[PDB]
Design a protein around this ligand. Structure first.
Ligand SMILES: [Mg+2]
Ligand SMILES: [Mg+2]
Lengths: 188, 188
């Protein structure tokens, strides 16, 4: 059955992430996948495709060299046997990474906003060696600026409704956060 | 007048931070100072002392070597002329870094909780090279754990009321945050 495939595929990614990078990028893959589910079950679209897609968009991305991963995913959907009628659609949106696709994309972009985002940011900021905030460098290179820079404007690129909904809630939190963050910056 | 001293002293720290470390640790010094004010003006204690203290607790800390900064602050309060009757109290609490002191300490510890804290954390996490969260490593080395580790238990060490109040509000936010952070971790 399909679930047995969507299952073994969960092993396919979980593994390939070990022969290199890190089996830590999985928690991201899943978060998007579980999210693509909840999104479909409120917007429609072919689940299996949505799932199989969200689960392999990353394997084609540090995979190798350009569209070299496509055939990497291509020849895989084969081993798992998937009528070209569907596969052609699965490994399709995996390129632009269609209601099915539209949802996967809403499930991936959503995974940038919210608490996690805030953290992902200052975190990436720490590694990259930068401050968190600086009144000498207003928004348009500190970590707090990145929010206005290319994050708060992500809730406007959501496609389906469920995604847009969640996005507004997530987006709102980053707003209120930077609101609580600032008052503290000035000891309020 | 005193304000002219609390002012020139603002220059004393602002400068010494340039001959080494970074004039970036100032935004922390101030945040505590402005905070020690708002706190006194609601709890009492000798302002000037509170201010002069909060403003120099850090200069005695990467200053040099052990209690070598004490005389660094000591001989300074002299140049600014400050009756030993007060100086003895100012550079005093600067050691344990008394209602005046009690407030400075409440104004310094508070500067660890809240949005900034959250950020300071993942930030320090990024630099130190660690994940943000990991279900394989429960609380008691990811950045999220540090919260329960030695942060959420800081609102219990506050002395005066105003500090305790603010602390509860600040503490609450870190709670709700880790609450919004988690739901996202499981795509809620
Ligand atoms: Mg992704
Ligand atoms: Mg301090």
């Amino acid at each position: 059955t399909k679930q047995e495939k969507i299952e073994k595929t969960i092993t396919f990614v979980k593994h390939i992430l070990e022969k290199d990078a890190s089996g830590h990028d999985w928690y991201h893959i899943r978060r998007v996948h579980k999210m693509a589910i909840s999104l479909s079950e409120q917007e429609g679209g072919n689940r299996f495709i949505i799932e199989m897609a969200a689960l392999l968009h990353d394997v084609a991305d540090l995979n190798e060299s350009e569209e070299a991963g496509m055939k990497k995913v291509s020849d895989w959907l084969e081993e798992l046997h998937v009528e070209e009628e569907e596969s052609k659609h699965v490994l399709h949106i995996i390129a632009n990474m269609s209601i099915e696709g539209k949802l996967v994309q809403d499930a991936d972009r959503l995974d940038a906003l919210g608490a996690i985002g805030i953290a992902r940011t200052f975190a990436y900021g720490g590694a990259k060696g930068r401050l968190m905030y600086d009144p000498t460098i207003p928004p348009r290179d500190p970590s707090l600026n990145h929010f206005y820079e290319k994050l708060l404007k992500l809730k406007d690129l959501m496609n389906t409704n469920a995604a847009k909904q969640e996005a507004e809630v997530r987006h709102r939190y980053m707003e209120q956060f930077i609101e609580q963050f600032m008052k503290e910056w000035n000891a309020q």
